[PDB]
Design a protein around this motif. Sequence first.
Motif, PDB file in Angstrom:
ATOM      1  N   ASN A  96      10.919  -6.329  35.449  1.00 31.95           N
ATOM      2  CA  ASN A  96      11.200  -5.287  34.455  1.00 31.95           C
ATOM      3  C   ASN A  96      11.527  -5.884  33.072  1.00 31.95           C
ATOM      4  OD1 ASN A  96      11.271  -2.315  35.556  1.00 31.95           O
ATOM      5  ND2 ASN A  96      12.085  -3.570  37.236  1.00 31.95           N
TER       6      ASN A  96
ATOM      7  N   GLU B 181       8.876  -5.941  29.036  1.00 26.84           N
ATOM      8  CA  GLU B 181       9.204  -5.745  27.616  1.00 26.84           C
ATOM      9  C   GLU B 181       8.802  -6.929  26.730  1.00 26.84           C
ATOM     10  OE1 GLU B 181      10.403  -2.762  26.562  1.00 26.84           O
ATOM     11  OE2 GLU B 181      10.228  -2.159  28.658  1.00 26.84           O
TER      12      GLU B 181
ATOM     13  N   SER C 246      19.053   2.328  38.398  1.00 28.51           N
ATOM     14  CA  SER C 246      17.743   2.711  37.882  1.00 28.51           C
ATOM     15  C   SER C 246      17.215   1.569  37.012  1.00 28.51           C
ATOM     16  CB  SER C 246      17.849   3.982  37.044  1.00 28.51           C
ATOM     17  OG  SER C 246      16.565   4.421  36.607  1.00 28.51           O
TER      18      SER C 246
ATOM     19  N   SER D 257      14.859   1.689  34.823  1.00 27.94           N
ATOM     20  CA  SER D 257      14.615   2.212  33.473  1.00 27.94           C
ATOM     21  C   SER D 257      15.897   2.414  32.646  1.00 27.94           C
ATOM     22  CB  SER D 257      13.804   3.508  33.528  1.00 27.94           C
ATOM     23  OG  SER D 257      14.432   4.445  34.376  1.00 27.94           O
ATOM     24  N   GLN D 258      16.994   2.825  33.284  1.00 30.16           N
ATOM     25  CA  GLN D 258      18.302   2.887  32.611  1.00 30.16           C
ATOM     26  C   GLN D 258      18.819   1.492  32.290  1.00 30.16           C
ATOM     27  OE1 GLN D 258      19.827   6.888  35.086  1.00 30.16           O
ATOM     28  NE2 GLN D 258      21.281   5.203  34.675  1.00 30.16           N
TER      29      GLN D 258
ATOM     30  N   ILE E 240      16.973  -1.190  31.702  1.00 26.32           N
ATOM     31  CA  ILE E 240      16.154  -1.660  30.581  1.00 26.32           C
ATOM     32  C   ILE E 240      16.534  -0.965  29.267  1.00 26.32           C
ATOM     33  CG2 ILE E 240      13.782  -1.793  29.645  1.00 26.32           C
ATOM     34  CD1 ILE E 240      14.202  -3.960  31.645  1.00 26.32           C
ATOM     35  N   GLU E 241      16.821   0.335  29.325  1.00 26.08           N
ATOM     36  CA  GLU E 241      17.332   1.091  28.172  1.00 26.08           C
ATOM     37  C   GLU E 241      18.624   0.472  27.606  1.00 26.08           C
ATOM     38  OE1 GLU E 241      17.838   5.808  26.865  1.00 26.08           O
ATOM     39  OE2 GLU E 241      18.048   5.281  28.993  1.00 26.08           O
ATOM     40  N   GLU E 242      19.549   0.092  28.489  1.00 25.63           N
ATOM     41  CA  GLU E 242      20.801  -0.559  28.075  1.00 25.63           C
ATOM     42  C   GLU E 242      20.604  -2.007  27.613  1.00 25.63           C
ATOM     43  OE1 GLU E 242      23.076   2.736  28.060  1.00 25.63           O
ATOM     44  OE2 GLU E 242      23.763   0.744  27.425  1.00 25.63           O
TER      45      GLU E 242
ATOM     46  N   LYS F 223      17.923  -3.052  26.007  1.00 21.84           N
ATOM     47  CA  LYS F 223      17.400  -2.841  24.653  1.00 21.84           C
ATOM     48  C   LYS F 223      18.498  -2.558  23.633  1.00 21.84           C
ATOM     49  CE  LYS F 223      12.720  -1.105  25.553  1.00 21.84           C
ATOM     50  NZ  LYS F 223      11.920   0.141  25.728  1.00 21.84           N
ATOM     51  N   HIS F 224      19.417  -1.665  24.000  1.00 28.74           N
ATOM     52  CA  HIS F 224      20.555  -1.287  23.151  1.00 28.74           C
ATOM     53  C   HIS F 224      21.348  -2.513  22.678  1.00 28.74           C
ATOM     54  CE1 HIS F 224      23.629   1.619  21.732  1.00 28.74           C
ATOM     55  NE2 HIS F 224      24.491   0.677  22.076  1.00 28.74           N
TER      56      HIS F 224
ATOM     57  N   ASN G 252       6.908   3.656  38.146  1.00 30.77           N
ATOM     58  CA  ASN G 252       6.815   3.635  36.681  1.00 30.77           C
ATOM     59  C   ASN G 252       5.887   2.546  36.125  1.00 30.77           C
ATOM     60  OD1 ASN G 252      10.124   4.704  36.864  1.00 30.77           O
ATOM     61  ND2 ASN G 252       8.606   5.866  35.683  1.00 30.77           N
TER      62      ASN G 252
END
Lengths: 121, 122, 237, 233
Positions: free
Chosen positions: B21, B25, B108, B110-111, B113-115, B117-118, C36
Amino acid sequence: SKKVLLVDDSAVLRKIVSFNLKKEGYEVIEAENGQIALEKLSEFTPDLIVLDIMMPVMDGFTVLKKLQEKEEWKRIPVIVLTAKGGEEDESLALSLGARKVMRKPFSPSQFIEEVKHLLNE
Amino acid sequence: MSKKVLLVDDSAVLRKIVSFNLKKEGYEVIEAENGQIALEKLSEFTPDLIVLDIMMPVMDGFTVLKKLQEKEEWKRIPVIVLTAKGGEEDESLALSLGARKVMRKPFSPSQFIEEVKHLLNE
Amino acid sequence: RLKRIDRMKTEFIANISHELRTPLTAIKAYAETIYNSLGELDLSTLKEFLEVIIDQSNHLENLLNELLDFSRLERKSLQINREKVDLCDLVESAVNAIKEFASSHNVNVLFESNVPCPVEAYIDPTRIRQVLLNLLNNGVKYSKKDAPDKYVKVILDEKDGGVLIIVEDNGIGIPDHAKDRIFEQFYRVDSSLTYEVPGTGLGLAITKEIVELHGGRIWVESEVGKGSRFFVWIPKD
Amino acid sequence: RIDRMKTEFIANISHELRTPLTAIKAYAETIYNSLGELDLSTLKEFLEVIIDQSNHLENLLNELLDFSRLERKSLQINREKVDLCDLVESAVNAIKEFASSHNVNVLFESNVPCPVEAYIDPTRIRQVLLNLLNNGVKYSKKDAPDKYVKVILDEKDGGVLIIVEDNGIGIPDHAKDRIFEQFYRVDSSLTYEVPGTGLGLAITKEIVELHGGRIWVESEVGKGSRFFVWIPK
Ligand SMILES: Nc1ncnc2c1ncn2[C@@H]1O[C@H](COP(=O)(O)OP(=O)(O)O)[C@@H](O)[C@H]1O
Ligand SMILES: Nc1ncnc2c1ncn2[C@@H]1O[C@H](COP(=O)(O)OP(=O)(O)O)[C@@H](O)[C@H]1O
Ligand SMILES: [Cl-]
Ligand SMILES: [Mg+2]
Ligand SMILES: [Mg+2]
């Protein structure tokens, strides 16, 4: 061509077993409980019944019992597919007339091998 | 200008999926099987982010976090703790030790990876 | 008087949660990633990730079978069924089954027989395989943290009109105060060298009851920081 | 006491974790062995099953963990200003899929006008709501056309009064004094195939009592049940 009565109260379970059954070219009729399963036997006589044990309304032990009490029903081979893991559960099911007992969790490929063995010969 | 991520967990199975994951990116990934190995890897390079398990043999993640705050060149590296420890007190301890965010397993992707990125984006 | 068993019960409940959480994390993360990343997954990686889901489900299944077998043994519904069988093949089969887990923690799995194979015995092969796998898993689980020559050895022999199986490791060892409690249900040694190691404390209680259903016994000799020997004695006929 | 019902509890964890695992294993092996025989929408549907079944499994592990935290007195609640009308709506949303799975309608009426304010831990009271909602579905009637679970909100005694009402199988009078205790489950023909640990209401009770509140029940066998949750402000 070959017709399979699939008896289980889980929609999730029926869907995956039906998919693997239809991969072999079998027809599939579903029943949500044991009582519905027996009502469906008036419409047609399947070549094989796949039977859960734990179901509301009517469980699979009493389905197996009532299958021995009818003349046309008694010869239909039955695979019990069940979360009940006890040796005494298996023994009860076999003496009630079941040809094969398989435990859940189960290999779909092993299950299909066993379905084939009862259908062919 | 690829962002480098130090991935610290004793589970190979866990490292592989987080590394997959992360690399989606475009981030470079350096793995460590325990906290001692993680700190030894910091001599080679300085990451933009450390992903840190807690429960590991040899050296655990609370000890890693503690040793990160002591050095001035480390102390600034952000850390996401990703851990099976779901206690409020475990989270509180990680945050007081200098972790920026604590995420529970199961997670998750995706969560996560979202964090990630942040923290990498300011 | 002694509500320690209630405290051990609370530990046990937390330990079920911990052991089952690890495969579940893999299952969830690998499934969501596949869902995904279908556009970004090549075929070999898609299949690899599916295999992880399958293998992690299987470990989960074995842990659920541990809880069920214990309840079956506790209720006394588990009635063994004996037959003639070769323990040399049974032991070989068991070490084959534990090989992936053993290489995961860098542990060599060895097998010796002090008498010539095949060694015939009147036993339930399913239940004795379950005893073997629990002792082999423990050999890997409680091996040293960082050492070059990790091992679990099964030594087989015929003694006292019966079969004697020894499972030897060179792992962390067991203290003396814990030696008379490791077979108890829910008991686990609490230390720095067992903090990250998952388990319920059920394995050896299941093994003990299975062994004693065969009319056999199980005992242990251990030195801290050196290793442990688990002895299993079964009558032949 | 606890040691009696512990063996049954161990078997119960086994049975409830077995059901999602069966789906996980069966769906994953099928995908693995049927890549040529799955269209894209069926592959994604089958992956969603694995994901949703993992999530139920995760909820069951959080039950075991929350209980061990409550027994150890490790769970420290954290109170804040919260809207319970939104909390209850958010809770009934989460339960809708499981509810339609068993043909149970989910309702919400507030006797006092919304929004109602309260000083509670939103996470822990959400956990209380879901356990009562899940129970309303789990123990609803077998074959009935008008099955329901209703959450009713009201302000009483300088506090909030949440009622969760069902028209399910009901609870025998001897069992009414024991449903809140750890590991207890009513054993009958009407709950033989219903999975559970007997931990839900024990967790709910301890959480409610950490807020200085109480929970109680009224039930008639064959009619239904009402669970009353009182929390101050
Ligand atoms: N080979 C071994 N070496 C060191 N310690 C062991 C070994 N086998 C068992 N033990 C100890 O005995 C305890 C009980 O073992 P077991 O009944 O298999 O439960 P578990 O492995 O789930 O903890 C373990 O927690 C561990 O402390
Ligand atoms: N809404 C309800 N209707 C009927 N019986 C209920 C209801 N809620 C709970 N019960 C009974 O109380 C018992 C304990 O509930 P709970 O603590 O949530 O555990 P579980 O749902 O795992 O059994 C259940 O086994 C059931 O017999
Ligand atoms: Cl939630
Ligand atoms: Mg069923
Ligand atoms: Mg770890």
